[PDB]
Design a protein around this ligand. Sequence first.
Ligand SMILES: [Cl-]
Ligand SMILES: [Cl-]
Length: 162
Amino acid sequence: MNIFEMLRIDEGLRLKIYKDTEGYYTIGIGHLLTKSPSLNAAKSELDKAIGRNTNGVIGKDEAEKLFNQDVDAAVRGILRNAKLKPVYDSLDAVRRAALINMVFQMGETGVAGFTNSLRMLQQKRWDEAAVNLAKSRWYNQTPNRAKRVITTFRTGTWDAYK
Ligand SMILES: [Cl-]
Ligand SMILES: [Cl-]
């Protein structure tokens, strides 16, 4: 198991514009297109992102390409973030994947806001951090995905994904 396969399980793959759990226009592997309600503003972003007139539909290769960019951007945002970097540096390889997963889903800003959990992760207090992470809209809104990520943090293994 690796970050890519982990996120692929969590986000799925859709080759036509769809709406995410929050109601936003998305495509491929969890690639947010716009928060705007307009399907046309979504097709426009889509075409800008792909470099061709897509008519709302892409191929597998195109989806995977967006996904590669997105993981890369997630990692780089963590490394540039003053709150996130120290956490990431302190963690083992599996737990690093779990932090990347949160950032891919909620953005650097959102994760950076989990102040207390971040401090517990840094201190390696696994069980306590798992408890604190659960008291979030995040866990309340996407409980099955949140539990998987949380278990990854608590245990340090890929169990929840096997
Ligand atoms: Cl893009
Ligand atoms: Cl879920």
